[PDB]
Ligand binder design. Structure first.
Ligand SMILES: C[C@@](O)(CCOP(=O)(O)OP(=O)(O)O)CC(=O)O
Ligand SMILES: C[C@@](O)(CCOP(=O)(O)OP(=O)(O)O)CC(=O)O
Lengths: 321, 323
């Protein structure tokens, strides 16, 4: 059996940081994100005759050990579930600008979940596909549904999954991603959030998340940009507050990251609707209503140290092709 | 000419930070703090109670003080008036040897010196603990510049419970503060207004409740001259304060880009074997603490970082003194 699927990465408005269960990737708190339409990972899976091990090809080129074992552990779960035991070849390609530092694990494992299961015979619901991708990478469960998506955190494998809050056409928002010229290789999200419990501030951050989800959920449903802008910056800062107060500390910000954050707030306060948010790295995602995207990109491009700015709109669910 | 006295005090650098007031008027803090006085920086204040003054007068480095500064100093002198049962107004002449435009806070040294000089002029004889409580009411961190050396501010929940004591004299540990002054066209939000927002941060209660653990480690590290324990805690404590600042509503981003450069460098330097650690107050300047034998190397490395205007060098100073 063989199948091919595509999926988009997503930008979290309310962040996932810290696991309640390491192996199942049940998060400590819920999260909300938006799919990025112009960024895509395409993956084909082919289970085979008498193959005794899986093999992974990422962008025409062969994959390294860690990436393979990740993908093979994930395919093990798809085997137990389908009652089959064939191994497979996995061919994935992404249109991500090279050296941008756009994390791919969410899109990667959302496309794998959809391609692997469908190639092996199953027809999982969106909700069960979300639960499946979650076990590859937490944030992958949010790229299974389309548009603006909420991860319901839960306390069990059955209870932790994502659902669409609103389709992409509900709100014309754009994510302008400032790629930072100078950036090295920061500690990975998995390793980084495993340290969250060393932070004196993580329990309070986690306890407070329902307040933040409720504000962002309503802001998306009501198309209330100011309420969203202030909360996504607040929420980004709460995550980075925990990172910077972990032991050892995780300082994902670059100096230019600081300039952009301060500028974005200044732009909004002087009449340009926009807001920043950052993941586990120095690039800055600037969310704005799309009418303002070209003004936001202009100002961003003018900031010394900004290598380039990518433009992205709200994307759809993962899909078989 | 009813009485006259002159006192000097030093500013201090907090290893465990004061951020957030429990009581705005009394300046009782939400949490305790530990600081080291800085020997090479001084505020000298003379107070002269006059029979013919109907209002106070404040001269700073030979120039009449701005209106807000006189208000601060005049309200504080009202406290002194009340605690002495005397109504004289005063001429307050003050001078300091700070580098001009460097952004180094002088409020702790200012009100420490004023507390000592004003009470001495008006004829009182206050114990160090009571002087500490008085200076606290001008500026919280001023209560830590009354005792000498390394100083702990016991936070308390009442006016009488909130005071500072010296936990070790300056000569107990040769530590140097290499202060990196950062070029900047930005006027930061003052510490008073900034920390009034601390209750808006979701993370402030957790920061506050964790303070005794942080103070225990720093208090003992000073006794033991345990620099690595001190280093890691003061960077963690600095980061916890700025975490609350940046998660306030509206947020307070006191760091400039070069502040981040220095913070990461200092961590690299210590990890490569040069003992030193950073801590930041409510502004972009970075205080780098090191055992004094490494000061010259730390200053050398700091001075070559683009955006560092200059580097000041300070050692542990003594208590506020009547001269
Ligand atoms: C910082 C983030 O981007 C988190 C990404 O976390 P991951 O999905 O990469 O973590 P794993 O479950 O270990 O794969 C914020 C977010 O997207 O919510
Ligand atoms: C950030 C700090 O330097 C605090 C300075 O606070 P202030 O003593 O200036 O506050 P007020 O009581 O309002 O005068 C950290 C510290 O010194 O502990």
């Amino acid at each position: 059996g063989q199948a091919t699927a595509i999926a988009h990465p997503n930008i979290a408005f309310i962040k996932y940081w810290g696991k309640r269960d390491a192996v199942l990737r049940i998060p400590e708190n819920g999260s909300i994100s938006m799919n990025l339409a112009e960024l895509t990972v395409k993956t084909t899976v082919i289970f085979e005759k008498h193959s005794r091990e899986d093999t992974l090809i990422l962008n025409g080129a062969l994959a390294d050990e860690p990436a393979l074992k990740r993908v093979s552990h994930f395919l093990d779960r798809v085997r137990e579930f389908a009652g089959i035991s064939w191994h497979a070849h996995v061919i994935s390609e992404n249109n991500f600008p090279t050296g941008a530092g756009i994390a791919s694990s969410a899109a990667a494992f959302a496309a794998l979940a959809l391609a692997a299961t469908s190639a092996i015979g199953l027809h999982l619901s969106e909700r069960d596909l979300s639960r499946l991708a979650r076990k590859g990478s937490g944030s992958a469960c949010r790229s299974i549904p389309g548009g603006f998506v909420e991860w319901i955190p839960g306390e069990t494998d059955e209870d932790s999954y994502a659902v669409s809050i609103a389709p992409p056409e509900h709100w014309a928002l754009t994510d302008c991603i400032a790629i930072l010229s100078t950036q090295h290789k920061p500690i990975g999200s998995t390793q980084g959030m495993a340290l969250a419990s060393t932070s004196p501030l993580q329990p309070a951050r986690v306890a407070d998340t329902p307040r933040r989800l409720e504000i962002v959920r309503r802001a998306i449903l009501e198309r209330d940009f100011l309420s969203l802008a202030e909360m996504i910056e607040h929420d980004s800062n709460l995550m980075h507050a925990v990172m910077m107060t972990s032991t050892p500390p995780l300082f994902y910000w670059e100096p230019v990251s600081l300039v952009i954050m301060k500028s974005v707030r200044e732009w909004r306060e002087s009449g340009l609707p926009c807001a920043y948010t950052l993941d586990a790295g120095p690039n800055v995602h600037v969310i704005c209503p799309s009418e303002y995207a070209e003004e936001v990109i202009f100002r961003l491009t003018s900031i010394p140290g900004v290598q380039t700015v990518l433009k992205a709109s709200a994307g759809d669910s993962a899909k078989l092709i």
